[PDB]
Amino acid sequence: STGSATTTPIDSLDDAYITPVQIGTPAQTLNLDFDTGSSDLWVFSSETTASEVDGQTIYTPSKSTTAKLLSGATWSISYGDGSSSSGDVYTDTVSVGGLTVTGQAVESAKKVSSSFTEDSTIDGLLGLAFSTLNTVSPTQQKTFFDNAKASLDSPVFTADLGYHAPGTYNFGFIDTTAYTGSITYTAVSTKQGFWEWTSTGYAVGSGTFKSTSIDGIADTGTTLLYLPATVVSAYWAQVSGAKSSSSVGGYVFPCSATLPSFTFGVGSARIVIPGDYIDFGPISTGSSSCFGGIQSSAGIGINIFGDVALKAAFVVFNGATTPTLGFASK
């Protein structure tokens, strides 16, 4: 089997992407944030505290003939941005882009933090990291991908995120029309539960490439590119007037700037992030200070190749017995 679903930016900045997902019988379609940096599929639901729901579409298990309470199971998750959610668990039929998994754990939110409430466009998350990070207790649950894997034509999914435009998540096949040149594969460590890999270096604009190992994670659920302070300083030093602002919470730059590109290495290959992808617009409405899309990972504890980086590439998440990651230009 295979599946193919379109993913759409939630706003004009590509802060996140939503993908329609069918849950239950008859289908209830919710727009979920596919997150290769976590491993829980959770949804706003008929159980979510009413004051914490503000425009989201909810899953109502009592209206699904295939829903079953996973008795005794609870979940609770905290994300890198400080947001969180928790609740109980049902199993139900879940379909993405025509690919169906029966018996998928659907984690029903009883509580969500303010960032989730405030985002009316995101009805929940669908985790695509390794199932070892799944938070369901006392019986840990598998991700949608892990459950689908044995049925897939090939044990892979791909992320093809758009810049200010829709893109695609495919399951079970590589669309050879969706990228240019060849795919360069690189080793993955699953030791922390992430799609963790080592970039071979970087360049700023038309500058020379610096060969240096940068361990980080491929994370579709993080908006920006978070890299070591040395690398980030070298980037922003090429932008007149750019500075790190503790009051704003990162690097800002004059909105009159033209940003240089940023290149990262994948083995001997190179992915170029155009300068425009690094512009996250005014820090507050009408400001002439703009927020940068490349930020320091210092104090996160991990480097994160988030959407800013990933949307410059066609990315293969290879879940074969030895997982790997592939990157191609597009």
Side-chain angles (χ1 to χ4, degrees), residues 1-62 64-67 69-109 112-141 143-148 150-190 192-242 244-330:
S1 61
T2 63
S4 181
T6 299
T7 193
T8 302
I10 65 166
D11 64 22
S12 64
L13 299 178
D14 299 347
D15 281 315
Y17 297 78
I18 50 173
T19 308
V21 177
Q22 283 70 48
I23 309 176
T25 309
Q28 301 180 39
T29 298
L30 275 65
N31 297 327
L32 305 187
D33 183 351
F34 283 24
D35 180 13
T36 63
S38 69
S39 306
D40 287 51
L41 193 176
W42 74 260
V43 297
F44 279 78
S45 75
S46 56
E47 301 178 330
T48 310
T49 301
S51 64
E52 295 178 350
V53 184
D54 189 3
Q56 294 80 11
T57 295
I58 63 166
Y59 169 57
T60 303
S62 66
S64 174
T65 59
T66 42
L69 181 71
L70 187 62
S71 184
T74 59
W75 63 278
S76 182
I77 194 164
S78 301
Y79 296 100
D81 67 355
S83 66
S84 66
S85 52
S86 62
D88 58 13
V89 187
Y90 294 82
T91 56
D92 209 338
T93 302
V94 173
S95 300
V96 176
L99 170 67
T100 302
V101 167
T102 58
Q104 175 64 45
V106 177
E107 301 172 36
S108 169
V112 305
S113 64
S114 59
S115 173
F116 289 116
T117 298
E118 291 161 0
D119 196 346
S120 66
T121 67
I122 293 175
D123 302 324
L125 267 65
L126 188 150
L128 293 167
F130 294 90
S131 294
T132 53
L133 294 179
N134 175 267
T135 76
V136 177
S137 179
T139 308
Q140 189 173 57
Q141 302 294 303
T143 70
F144 176 82
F145 179 52
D146 261 5
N147 282 323
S151 302
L152 294 178
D153 291 356
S154 181
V156 305
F157 68 90
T158 65
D160 181 9
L161 303 178
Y163 166 67
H164 295 348
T168 306
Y169 283 102
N170 289 330
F171 293 82
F173 72 107
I174 288 159
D175 180 358
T176 56
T177 75
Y179 62 87
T180 57
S182 57
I183 307 177
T184 298
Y185 291 86
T186 196
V188 164
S189 172
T190 64
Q192 293 188 87
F194 299 122
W195 294 92
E196 187 171 2
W197 65 290
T198 303
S199 172
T200 50
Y202 70 99
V204 176
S206 60
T208 61
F209 186 86
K210 176 69 169 182
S211 291
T212 186
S213 292
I214 304 169
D215 296 335
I217 66 169
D219 184 2
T220 57
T222 292
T223 313
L224 308 184
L225 174 53
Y226 294 87
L227 290 174
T230 49
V231 178
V232 177
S233 182
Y235 179 81
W236 290 109
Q238 297 305 310
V239 179
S240 293
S244 183
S245 167
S246 56
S247 57
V248 175
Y251 281 90
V252 296
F253 68 93
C255 225
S256 59
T258 301
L259 296 176
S261 63
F262 184 89
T263 301
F264 63 94
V266 183
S268 59
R270 307 288 180 253
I271 299 294
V272 181
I273 304 171
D276 289 347
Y277 290 25
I278 300 162
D279 178 19
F280 279 74
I283 60 170
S284 299
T285 305
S287 180
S288 69
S289 184
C290 274
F291 197 70
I294 294 176
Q295 296 294 345
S296 177
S297 62
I300 292 177
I302 197 159
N303 298 305
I304 308 172
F305 293 86
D307 297 333
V308 163
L310 303 181
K311 74 179 81 167
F314 177 86
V315 187
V316 181
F317 294 78
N318 171 28
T321 307
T322 300
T324 65
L325 271 174
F327 292 82
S329 295
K330 66 185 184 190

